[PDB]
Amino acid sequence: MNIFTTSILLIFILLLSPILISMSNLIKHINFPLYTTTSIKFSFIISLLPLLMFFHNNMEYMITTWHWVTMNSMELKMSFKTDFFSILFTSVALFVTWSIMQFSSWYMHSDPNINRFIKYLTLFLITMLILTSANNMFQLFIGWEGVGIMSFLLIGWWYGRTDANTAALQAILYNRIGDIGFILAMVWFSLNMNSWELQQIMFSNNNDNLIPLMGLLIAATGKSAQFGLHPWLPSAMEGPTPVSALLHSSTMVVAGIFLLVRFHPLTTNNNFILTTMLCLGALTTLFTAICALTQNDIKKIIAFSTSSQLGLMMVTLGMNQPHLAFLHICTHAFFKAMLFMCSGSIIHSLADEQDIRKMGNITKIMPFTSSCLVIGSLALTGMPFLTGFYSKDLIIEAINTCNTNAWALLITLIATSMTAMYSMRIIYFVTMTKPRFPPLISINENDPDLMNPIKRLAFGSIFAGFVISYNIPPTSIPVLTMPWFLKTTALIISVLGFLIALELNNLTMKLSMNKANPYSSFSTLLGFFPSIIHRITPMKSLNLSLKTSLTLLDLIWLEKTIPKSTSTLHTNMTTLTTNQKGLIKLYFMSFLINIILIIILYSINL
Amino acid sequence: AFCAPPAYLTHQQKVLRLYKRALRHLESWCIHRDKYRYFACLMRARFEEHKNEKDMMRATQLLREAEEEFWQNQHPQPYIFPDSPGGTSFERYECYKVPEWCLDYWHPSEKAMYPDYFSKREQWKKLRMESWDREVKQLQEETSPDGIMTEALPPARREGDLPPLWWHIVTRPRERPT
Amino acid sequence: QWQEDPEPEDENVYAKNPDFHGYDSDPVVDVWNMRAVFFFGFSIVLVFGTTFVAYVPDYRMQEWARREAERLVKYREVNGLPIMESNYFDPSKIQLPEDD
Amino acid sequence: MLKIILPSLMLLPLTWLSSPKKTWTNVTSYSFLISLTSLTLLWQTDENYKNFSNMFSSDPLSTPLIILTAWLLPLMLMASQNHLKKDNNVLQKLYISMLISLQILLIMTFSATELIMFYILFEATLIPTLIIITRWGNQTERLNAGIYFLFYTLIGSIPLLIALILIQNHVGTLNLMILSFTTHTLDASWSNNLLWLACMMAFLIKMPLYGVHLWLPKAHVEAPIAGSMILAAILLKLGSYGMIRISIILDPLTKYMAYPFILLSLWGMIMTSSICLRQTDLKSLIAYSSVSHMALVIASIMIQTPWSFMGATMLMIAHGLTSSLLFCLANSNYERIHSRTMIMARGLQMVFPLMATWWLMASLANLALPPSINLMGELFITMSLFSWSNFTIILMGINIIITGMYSMYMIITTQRGKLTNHMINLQPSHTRELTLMALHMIPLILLTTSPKLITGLT
Amino acid sequence: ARQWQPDIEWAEQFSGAVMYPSKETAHWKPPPWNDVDI
Amino acid sequence: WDKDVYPEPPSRTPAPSPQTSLPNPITYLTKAYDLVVDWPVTLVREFIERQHAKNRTYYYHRQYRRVPDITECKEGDVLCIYEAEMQWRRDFKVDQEIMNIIQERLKACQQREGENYQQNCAKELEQFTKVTKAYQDRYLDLGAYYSARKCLAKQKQRMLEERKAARQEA
Amino acid sequence: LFQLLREHWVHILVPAGFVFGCYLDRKDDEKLTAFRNKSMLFQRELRPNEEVTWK
Ligand SMILES: CCCCCCCCCCCCCCCCCC(=O)OC[C@H](COP(=O)(O)OCCN)OC(=O)CCCCCCCCCCCCCCCCC
Ligand SMILES: CCCCCCCCCCCCCCCCCC(=O)OC[C@H](COP(=O)(O)OCCN)OC(=O)CCCCCCCCCCCCCCCCC
């Protein structure tokens, strides 16, 4: 059905159209923000047409558009897969993007370079979708590196600020450590089984496939902020709030989770790596959640929640439940996007206050965002019958029913109670409290560009879990049979998580115990991974270059040995041979010596 | 940022600058307001007593134990305002603070529009060159009679003279370029 | 002191010749040294060159080999011969060292 | 191939005979077309390589370069029109001619059948280069740099001279065609183990290996922009082209006589990449970037697997174009700033909006962003190196992380951050500066569309 | 801003009857320009 | 494209069997695509091909005929061996696009048969080893300086083994 | 016509090189014309009224 193929190729052409308009002089004359917002809107509708097709009958289309090099045995070609993962994600991503660009127009209003900002956001979407629908992994690499570079360009939008520059260099470094893993996997699949195309890599099921998948797991940990190198996604919040929503919140981070689902057929064979990520996903879930409890920056708390939810997503991939992990990716995108733009609304409406401490009683001052915030908060806490509930409790009870690390099982559940706690922290401090904002009040959220997108995503946050769960193909053969405590555990732990947090917030209002330091710190300054591993490594890695590798072995030792020594050896030799009295007697006698030696040279060799 | 740094700090400015860090690091612990305003007038009490200690030695022994009490009772994430160091919005709108000596390489076409703008700009540049001599001379005639020099610069002291080394405190790129 | 010149300043060529293109100080040479460089540079090397390079046909035979394979794979499969026999130089031609 | 060459020679008469005012445009316009005639060699519709005549040949490995050598002469003459525009009208016509002779000689060296024709032309290229570096070099130390560039190459060169005359006696002709279709198998003696080192060492020296690369940082530092472009883009690659054509003979020894260099290069790749991380002179950092990205090449021309060689050919052409682009933009900052220091000049995008886009694309070419021939190249060398020993990824894995860090640091501390308060005001960008860049990157974009052309002999 | 042309000091070294003057080798002072001795 | 060099299985499609009153949102759209996207294009395309068929031209394949190989070729005779290293370097590619097709024919057979690839697609993976075990046995150890003399030796080093092992079995 | 003052005197220098170049490269062929058509892969028999295969 060409309608299907053409549609998958068309979304890319339509989104690339804003990029070249800015290349030509035409954008000055038309409005770039409005034009870009409309075309993503049309791209979402175009994406819907294949999505309905896939629902009718499950067909997967591999589209080989262009050939790039024959390269002898390994031919390289540009291929877009249209498997359930690719088209489901393509639709969810563009809806979020359509929401954010409208938000972007309101948020960055008064920025002198709005058009460039919108331009990079769509370039990000083009790389993100290429990363999504990539058959051969070389294209997956183009997407993997591609979102990394544009994140660097967009985290540090405001280049002047060194803090933004530091975060951008952070993000590239963590991503590049991840890139080493993908290169290792790519090289192993460029040798052994031979083609970077997924359709053939999957014929490596009954092989070792540990050297390679360990590489992809390493790539995922860097891209998805698992316990190892978890800090750059918190650091990424130095970016503009809309950038934080579409890339820090949904498309960029889920890329690591998406890669492993693509390569799962291979993942199911190796038991060792499955528990490895189950284990690290579990550690990141709580580690990030505990850090979020004491953070006082609104954007920071949401970002930690982005990492904690992906930690749960990592856990399901670790328990070899790929389809549900993808289901959470889609539902995760709707609500996290909402909360970040919700705070975008609060931060912009207030005098750019990004701290929960000075922000209060937004519920009465701004009901529209507060309503959106609690809708999102409950979805994050898996309120029954909301989008989180359809996918999240499936994951919870999956854990409660599988054979798993006891430590992983316990931490994931309290991580769920912690998600309710920090969710409670945000609404109590941000919304339900006496106002503590600066005294002049100038709040307006009436702008259509704020409401509309927030309104549209809110509709998605309310109904998406209903629609996606029923429509997707039956998969995973879930276990609905459980003792009732386990069946309802997700619901109860979420309930008491808020209950306990609400209790603690009340304790704050009293006039007592101004200071409270119960390991609060470990929690508040990111588990101290940032304070220690960011000051030692960059210090011991640069000291060795300047002091040891550059000046010691370069410069002096490699210049005194080869280039300089040969300089000296000769210089000294000329000094002795050319220091001559000039007297004839001396010189002549040397002629005597010569005659003598030559007489002998003949004599002995007679 | 405006005034110049004093060489050594007095006892007072060290005490009175703790009253700021302290009270401001007490409003991170006391997230609410009534609790804070309470727990803080109790802070002043601490500083209010031991105000009239005349025994310097003692005073510098209350200060040295105050700033260690504080270091161990500080909040890791205090409330630092935006536009202040470390916290956000600090260098945000610096990408848009171009340094104003760049409008001098504009093409005669660009400066063709925006006409009256450059008519006033050329006046100010006449002001700057018209006084560099009287300024530097002032800066010098009033030079220190000793090696003791502070970064403080003199006012005008005569009509028509423009308070010196002024071209970059005035003509500063505007804070929010937006 | 040894006589030598005082440092020569670098002129703001953009002060006069406000249309300076960076090639030469007097204006007409500049204009005619970019009107010929953008042209011979971009207009008939990046364009005519890429046109010609794009149309080089079956470069290094890799357009020929995707057919010869197809008729060999067509011929070998239908006649039942192995698609890529395992020895290329026929064993009969080889005169292996007999003793060893 | 005498159209890529004779018309070139005639450039010299044109630089001299032409008017002082019109000398620049006649030379630059004509060599752009000289590059267009060079493109004809790319028409290879068959495997049989093109033996134009007895002495002159062009095979897949040389053709991708001859075109680059012809392409940069236009660019070199466009990047040096500023400095060298303060000269006496006879110093210019000397510089223009010097640049012209480099590609005449380099075109022939890359298009030479007899290996000693390579040697005579190979070592001749030093004369034009040393003059460009020493005569017009800005710093007090170019006399020194020139000495380093002449001796390191020369001491390596005389061993190759003895070796090639040696094989001519052993085989009977230094004709690359025959030497290939003839049985020259070294016998792993102690002596042969020396022959191999004699032939490879001269090539390994101008292709900076970790042990002998000190000449390149010193040379590019004080060299004028045109000399630094030539050294990075064509001069260093002369060493690689030589290693590809000379190891056709000495076939058995490199299996075991390469370990020393391979390890020298891969560890060298890490240390050279790292010292880029804290080097204050921008031209210094690009030069060590050049050493590391060329250390990868000597580690693929020695593993000797089809992909290595293909990776090498991809990377050499690609890194050549990228490095120049970096050396060319470094010069544009140097001429307005008047200092090579990286720390000064912070925030330029705020004042030079586009040059910064060129800086960004050059850095992304410098690090391996994927839809670029630069990445395809490294991806391939990486693969083979992995095949040689799976452990190689660790060392070729510390280099990728470091390469990302220094490439972006050049962008972060030169083209971002707050603007420098008031250095000599930075005059706007000339259109020549920007084109000289565009001319470097537009070909990098076009080649990445069809990588097959620069794919090597393998 | 000026390619550094050699100053007097760079020139000085090349004077003296021997480029690399060692102990009791600096004693030698350049030969008379006229090629005639006192 | 030759249905036999790039095969392709016959298609079996379940017939439409709607069981809902609601109207399928796909069928309507297609009815449009077919009119506003296909018909317009279809019209142009034809008009292309008739423009082509007026001055229809032809291009042939350049049959390269066989020629003496290395084993027939004198030692040191650079003429004959040159003609014979090309004849091989040529078949080093014809024997490589063949392997390109098995790389491809398979890839399709695992997209066309998902969840069954483990089984239905074993007609080709049996061939991907019947072809890979051969490509490994004539072209693999060789350096980047692959030449017919070296394949002649890579083989003949092993023809000893298919003669020493055989003799050994005795 | 050879307008002087660098009018066509010079502009025709490089172009002329090309022609001379092409004149030699087609002359080199004339020399290396053994095996004109005596090569094995391409040894067709002369088609009627055709002097030589490749000139
Ligand atoms: C999972 C269980 C085990 C858990 C522990 C396992 C180890 C986890 C960590 C492994 C190593 C991760 C990378 C280490 C460096 C991390 C990046 C970094 O430190 O950069 C941050 C630095 C300062 O930024 P920051 O402290 O965030 O503050 C910004 C706001 N003030 O900003 C900077 O620019 C610093 C300087 C950067 C440029 C030079 C950096 C060194 C480059 C070469 C070395 C790279 C790191 C070592 C090699 C890779 C190791 C994996
Ligand atoms: C030659 C040796 C090296 C010489 C270096 C210096 C040469 C300078 C002078 C000559 C310049 C022109 C000649 C070199 C460029 C050649 C361009 C070319 O060959 O295009 C071929 C392409 C047809 O594609 P083809 O590969 O034939 O089809 C594959 C079938 N399997 O035809 C086309 O598609 C043309 C398309 C034009 C626009 C293409 C833009 C595509 C950009 C894609 C990448 C975008 C992202 C790049 C990121 C880079 C990051 C650094």
Side-chain angles (χ1 to χ4, degrees), chain F residues 91-114:
Chain F
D91 289 345
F92 180 72
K93 298 183 71 68
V94 172
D95 293 331
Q96 198 76 47
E97 295 293 329
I98 294 165
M99 183 66 75
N100 187 340
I101 293 166
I102 309 299
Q103 292 279 327
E104 171 178 344
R105 190 179 298 181
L106 177 68
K107 287 177 184 57
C109 175
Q110 189 268 344
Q111 176 75 345
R112 186 192 296 100
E113 299 287 0

CSV table of all heavy atoms in Angstrom, one decimal, chain F residues 91-114:
chain,number,residue,atom,x,y,z
F,91,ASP,N,36.6,-11.1,-11.3
F,91,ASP,CA,35.8,-12.1,-10.7
F,91,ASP,C,35.8,-12.0,-9.2
F,91,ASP,O,34.9,-12.6,-8.5
F,91,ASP,CB,36.2,-13.6,-11.1
F,91,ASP,CG,35.9,-13.9,-12.5
F,91,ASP,OD1,35.1,-13.2,-13.2
F,91,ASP,OD2,36.5,-14.9,-13.0
F,92,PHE,N,36.8,-11.3,-8.6
F,92,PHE,CA,36.7,-11.0,-7.2
F,92,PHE,C,35.5,-10.1,-6.9
F,92,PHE,O,35.1,-10.0,-5.7
F,92,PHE,CB,38.0,-10.3,-6.8
F,92,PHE,CG,38.0,-9.9,-5.3
F,92,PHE,CD1,38.1,-10.9,-4.3
F,92,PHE,CD2,37.9,-8.6,-4.9
F,92,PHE,CE1,38.2,-10.5,-3.0
F,92,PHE,CE2,37.9,-8.3,-3.6
F,92,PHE,CZ,38.1,-9.2,-2.6
F,93,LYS,N,34.9,-9.4,-7.9
F,93,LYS,CA,33.8,-8.6,-7.7
F,93,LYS,C,32.5,-9.3,-8.1
F,93,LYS,O,31.5,-9.2,-7.4
F,93,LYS,CB,34.0,-7.3,-8.6
F,93,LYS,CG,35.1,-6.5,-8.2
F,93,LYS,CD,35.2,-5.2,-9.1
F,93,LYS,CE,34.1,-4.2,-8.7
F,93,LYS,NZ,34.3,-3.6,-7.4
F,94,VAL,N,32.5,-10.0,-9.3
F,94,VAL,CA,31.3,-10.8,-9.7
F,94,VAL,C,31.0,-11.8,-8.6
F,94,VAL,O,29.9,-12.1,-8.3
F,94,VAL,CB,31.6,-11.4,-11.1
F,94,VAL,CG1,30.4,-12.4,-11.4
F,94,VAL,CG2,31.7,-10.3,-12.1
F,95,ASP,N,32.1,-12.3,-8.0
F,95,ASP,CA,31.9,-13.2,-6.9
F,95,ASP,C,31.6,-12.5,-5.6
F,95,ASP,O,31.5,-13.2,-4.5
F,95,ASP,CB,33.1,-14.1,-6.6
F,95,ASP,CG,33.4,-15.1,-7.8
F,95,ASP,OD1,32.4,-15.5,-8.5
F,95,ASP,OD2,34.5,-15.5,-8.0
F,96,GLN,N,31.4,-11.2,-5.6
F,96,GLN,CA,31.2,-10.4,-4.4
F,96,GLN,C,29.8,-9.8,-4.4
F,96,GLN,O,29.2,-9.6,-3.4
F,96,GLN,CB,32.2,-9.2,-4.4
F,96,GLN,CG,32.3,-8.6,-3.1
F,96,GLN,CD,33.1,-9.4,-2.1
F,96,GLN,OE1,34.2,-9.9,-2.4
F,96,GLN,NE2,32.6,-9.6,-0.9
F,97,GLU,N,29.2,-9.5,-5.6
F,97,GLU,CA,27.9,-9.0,-5.7
F,97,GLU,C,26.9,-10.2,-5.6
F,97,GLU,O,25.8,-10.0,-5.1
F,97,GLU,CB,27.7,-8.3,-7.1
F,97,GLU,CG,28.5,-7.0,-7.2
F,97,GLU,CD,28.0,-5.9,-6.3
F,97,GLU,OE1,26.8,-5.9,-5.9
F,97,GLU,OE2,28.8,-5.1,-5.9
F,98,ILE,N,27.3,-11.4,-6.0
F,98,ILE,CA,26.6,-12.6,-5.7
F,98,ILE,C,26.4,-12.7,-4.2
F,98,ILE,O,25.3,-13.0,-3.7
F,98,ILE,CB,27.4,-13.8,-6.2
F,98,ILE,CG1,27.4,-13.9,-7.7
F,98,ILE,CG2,26.7,-15.1,-5.6
F,98,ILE,CD1,28.4,-14.8,-8.3
F,99,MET,N,27.5,-12.5,-3.4
F,99,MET,CA,27.4,-12.5,-2.0
F,99,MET,C,26.6,-11.3,-1.5
F,99,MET,O,26.0,-11.3,-0.4
F,99,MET,CB,28.8,-12.4,-1.4
F,99,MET,CG,28.9,-12.5,0.1
F,99,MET,SD,28.3,-14.1,0.8
F,99,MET,CE,29.7,-15.1,0.4
F,100,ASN,N,26.5,-10.2,-2.3
F,100,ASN,CA,25.7,-9.0,-2.0
F,100,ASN,C,24.2,-9.5,-2.1
F,100,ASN,O,23.4,-9.0,-1.3
F,100,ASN,CB,26.0,-7.8,-2.8
F,100,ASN,CG,25.2,-6.6,-2.3
F,100,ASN,OD1,24.2,-6.7,-1.6
F,100,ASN,ND2,25.7,-5.4,-2.7
F,101,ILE,N,23.9,-10.3,-3.1
F,101,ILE,CA,22.5,-10.7,-3.3
F,101,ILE,C,22.0,-11.6,-2.1
F,101,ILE,O,20.9,-11.5,-1.7
F,101,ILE,CB,22.4,-11.4,-4.6
F,101,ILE,CG1,22.6,-10.3,-5.7
F,101,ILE,CG2,21.0,-12.0,-4.8
F,101,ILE,CD1,22.8,-10.9,-7.1
F,102,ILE,N,22.9,-12.5,-1.7
F,102,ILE,CA,22.5,-13.4,-0.6
F,102,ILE,C,22.4,-12.6,0.7
F,102,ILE,O,21.6,-12.9,1.6
F,102,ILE,CB,23.5,-14.6,-0.4
F,102,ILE,CG1,23.7,-15.3,-1.8
F,102,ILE,CG2,22.9,-15.5,0.6
F,102,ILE,CD1,22.5,-15.9,-2.4
F,103,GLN,N,23.2,-11.6,0.9
F,103,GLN,CA,23.0,-10.6,2.0
F,103,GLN,C,21.7,-10.0,1.9
F,103,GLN,O,21.0,-9.8,2.9
F,103,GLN,CB,24.1,-9.5,1.9
F,103,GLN,CG,25.5,-10.0,2.3
F,103,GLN,CD,25.8,-10.1,3.7
F,103,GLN,OE1,25.2,-9.4,4.6
F,103,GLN,NE2,26.7,-11.0,4.1
F,104,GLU,N,21.2,-9.7,0.6
F,104,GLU,CA,19.9,-9.0,0.5
F,104,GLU,C,18.8,-10.0,0.4
F,104,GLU,O,17.8,-9.8,1.2
F,104,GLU,CB,20.0,-8.2,-0.8
F,104,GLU,CG,18.6,-7.7,-1.2
F,104,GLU,CD,18.7,-6.8,-2.5
F,104,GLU,OE1,19.8,-6.5,-2.9
F,104,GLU,OE2,17.6,-6.6,-3.1
F,105,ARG,N,18.8,-11.0,-0.4
F,105,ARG,CA,17.7,-11.9,-0.5
F,105,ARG,C,17.3,-12.3,0.9
F,105,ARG,O,16.1,-12.4,1.2
F,105,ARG,CB,18.0,-13.1,-1.4
F,105,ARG,CG,16.8,-14.0,-1.7
F,105,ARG,CD,17.3,-15.1,-2.6
F,105,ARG,NE,17.8,-14.7,-3.9
F,105,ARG,CZ,18.2,-15.5,-4.8
F,105,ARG,NH1,18.1,-16.8,-4.6
F,105,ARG,NH2,18.8,-15.1,-5.9
F,106,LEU,N,18.2,-12.6,1.8
F,106,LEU,CA,17.9,-13.0,3.2
F,106,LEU,C,17.3,-11.9,3.9
F,106,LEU,O,16.2,-12.1,4.5
F,106,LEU,CB,19.2,-13.3,3.9
F,106,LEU,CG,19.0,-13.7,5.4
F,106,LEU,CD1,18.3,-15.0,5.5
F,106,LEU,CD2,20.4,-13.8,6.0
F,107,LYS,N,17.8,-10.7,3.9
F,107,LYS,CA,17.3,-9.6,4.7
F,107,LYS,C,15.8,-9.5,4.4
F,107,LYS,O,15.0,-9.3,5.3
F,107,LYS,CB,18.0,-8.3,4.3
F,107,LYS,CG,19.4,-8.1,4.8
F,107,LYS,CD,20.0,-6.8,4.3
F,107,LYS,CE,21.4,-6.7,4.8
F,107,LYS,NZ,22.2,-7.8,4.3
F,108,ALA,N,15.4,-9.7,3.2
F,108,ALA,CA,14.0,-9.6,2.8
F,108,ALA,C,13.2,-10.7,3.4
F,108,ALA,O,12.1,-10.6,3.9
F,108,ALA,CB,13.8,-9.6,1.4
F,109,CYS,N,13.8,-11.9,3.4
F,109,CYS,CA,13.1,-13.1,3.9
F,109,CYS,C,13.0,-13.2,5.4
F,109,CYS,O,12.5,-14.2,5.9
F,109,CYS,CB,13.9,-14.3,3.4
F,109,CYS,SG,13.4,-15.9,4.1
F,110,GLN,N,13.4,-12.1,6.1
F,110,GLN,CA,13.3,-12.0,7.6
F,110,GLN,C,12.4,-10.8,7.9
F,110,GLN,O,12.2,-10.6,9.0
F,110,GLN,CB,14.6,-11.9,8.2
F,110,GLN,CG,14.6,-12.1,9.7
F,110,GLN,CD,14.5,-10.7,10.4
F,110,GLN,OE1,14.7,-9.7,9.8
F,110,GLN,NE2,14.1,-10.8,11.7
F,111,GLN,N,12.0,-10.1,6.9
F,111,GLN,CA,11.1,-9.0,7.1
F,111,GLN,C,9.8,-9.5,6.6
F,111,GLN,O,8.7,-9.1,7.0
F,111,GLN,CB,11.4,-7.7,6.4
F,111,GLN,CG,10.4,-6.6,6.5
F,111,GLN,CD,10.5,-5.9,7.9
F,111,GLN,OE1,11.1,-6.5,8.8
F,111,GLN,NE2,9.8,-4.8,8.0
F,112,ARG,N,9.8,-10.4,5.6
F,112,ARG,CA,8.6,-10.9,5.0
F,112,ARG,C,8.1,-12.0,5.9
F,112,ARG,O,6.9,-12.4,5.7
F,112,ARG,CB,8.8,-11.4,3.6
F,112,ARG,CG,7.6,-11.8,2.9
F,112,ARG,CD,7.8,-12.6,1.6
F,112,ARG,NE,8.5,-11.7,0.6
F,112,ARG,CZ,9.9,-11.8,0.4
F,112,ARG,NH1,10.6,-12.7,1.1
F,112,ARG,NH2,10.4,-11.0,-0.5
F,113,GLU,N,8.9,-12.5,6.8
F,113,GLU,CA,8.4,-13.7,7.6
F,113,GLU,C,8.8,-13.5,9.0
F,113,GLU,O,9.5,-14.3,9.6
F,113,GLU,CB,9.1,-14.9,7.1
F,113,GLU,CG,8.8,-15.3,5.7
F,113,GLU,CD,7.4,-15.9,5.5
F,113,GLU,OE1,6.7,-15.9,6.4
F,113,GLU,OE2,7.1,-16.2,4.3
F,114,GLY,N,8.3,-12.4,9.6
F,114,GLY,CA,8.6,-12.1,11.0
F,114,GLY,C,7.9,-13.1,11.9
F,114,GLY,O,6.8,-13.5,11.6
